[PDB]
């Protein structure tokens, strides 16, 4: 799959504001015949944390 087709979302507001915190983003995944056939569900990570 060309997983770079999907969205460069901003990182979510930092979960803990000032200690050992985390943030995440996701691809805004819209499914299409392309996504179904070109192994996108298999190889693309849906959300980064």
């Amino acid at each position: 799959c060309f997983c770079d087709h999907y969205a460069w979302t901003q990182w979510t507001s930092c979960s803990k504001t000032c200690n050992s915190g985390t943030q995440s983003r996701h691809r805004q995944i819209v499914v299409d015949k392309y996504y179904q056939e070109n192994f996108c569900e298999q190889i693309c990570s849906k959300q980064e944390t």
Binding site: Q10, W11, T12, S13, C14, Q23
Partner: protein, 48 residues
């Protein structure tokens, strides 16, 4: 009144200037884009 985009103010004699963060620019640091890791939001800062 604080610079945007994590820039730190300083007082020129009777005046304010901004130490902007890299490749973000202008007097308030409003224009351009930051480089390196970013935390998002706006960290708080005091008035006098």
């Amino acid at each position: 009144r604080p610079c945007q985009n994590g820039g730190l103010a300083t007082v020129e004699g009777t005046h304010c200037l901004c130490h902007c963060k890299p490749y973000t620019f202008g007097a308030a640091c409003e224009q351009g884009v930051l480089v390196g890791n970013q935390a998002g939001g706006v960290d708080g800062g005091w008035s006098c």
